[PDB]
Design a protein around this ligand. Sequence first.
Ligand SMILES: Cc1cc2nc3c(=O)[nH]c(=O)nc-3n(C[C@H](O)[C@H](O)[C@H](O)COP(=O)(O)O)c2cc1C
Length: 140
Amino acid sequence: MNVRLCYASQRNEKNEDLLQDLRDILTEARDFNDLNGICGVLYYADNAFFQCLEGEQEVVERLFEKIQKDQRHYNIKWLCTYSIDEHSFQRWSMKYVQRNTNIETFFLNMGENTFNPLLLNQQNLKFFLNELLIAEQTKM
Ligand SMILES: Cc1cc2nc3c(=O)[nH]c(=O)nc-3n(C[C@H](O)[C@H](O)[C@H](O)COP(=O)(O)O)c2cc1C
């Protein structure tokens, strides 16, 4: 089974150098994901991560277990795991997306002015993933 797994987490602010942490996370993620048949997107804004992992169920669940142990975030909240009929994020071992006015417009239009993916219902999380898919990747 191929699956998409999504979660949200909090930036651990004990870590002072966020810019280097994001570089390190994306370096590690792109290396491992490429070697293990995983793709997806990492969204970062307002001290919170949202990630979607796509790939074979066992490798994706194993990677999510490893990510839970990572001291660069805390308060990991699993949002969904479902089987997928297409790999939407196959262009990227790990796409990087930051907040932009289109994503802010998306949240405002559906009434969620916190811009917090953790608050989205199943349908709105699918729409949020669409925004992350069409967003121009942020070059790190
Ligand atoms: C928000 C976030 C997202 C991450 N995404 C991935 C990823 O997609 N793939 C990956 O291999 N590592 C990712 N990591 C990194 C792993 O958690 C990190 O490389 C791992 O802790 C190294 O584990 P090890 O010491 O067992 O090698 C991520 C880390 C964070 C904080």
